[PDB]
């Protein structure tokens, strides 16, 4: 197709990890479910896992896309799939929300 061109203040970042052992040890909470519509966001981090170690992913992070694919139509089960099928390398688009730092 075409290489394309990206911006600088993209805002969103990608996540690169290496299959540690039988998965990445990353869990997601919420997402688009028939019992409710919620924005996909990391839930639990497999202790001593590739996700927690990296520190790039934390509980609460919001997911906008995955493996360069639009999740606007991918459910909690559809998203995970793309991840596993992604291959030996994981790629997820996470964009931290806009919040203020706690002060005393």
Curated annotation (Swiss-Prot):
Chain ranges of the PDZ domain: 14-98
Protein name per the record: PDZ domain-containing protein MAGIX
Species assigned in the record: Homo sapiens
UniProt lineage: Eukaryota, Metazoa, Chordata, Craniata, Vertebrata
């Amino acid at each position: 197709g075409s290489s394309g061109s990206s911006g600088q203040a993209s805002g969103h970042f990608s996540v690169e990890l290496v299959r540690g052992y039988a998965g990445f040890g990353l869990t997601l909470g919420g997402g688009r479910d028939v019992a409710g519509d919620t924005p996909l966001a990391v839930r639990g981090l497999l202790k001593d896992g590739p996700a927690q170690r990296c520190g790039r992913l934390e509980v609460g992070d919001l997911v906008l896309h995955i493996n360069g694919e639009s999740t606007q139509g991918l459910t909690h089960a559809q998203a995970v799939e793309r991840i596993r099928a992604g291959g030996p390398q994981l790629h997820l688009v996470i964009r931290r929300p806009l919040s203020g730092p706690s002060s005393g």
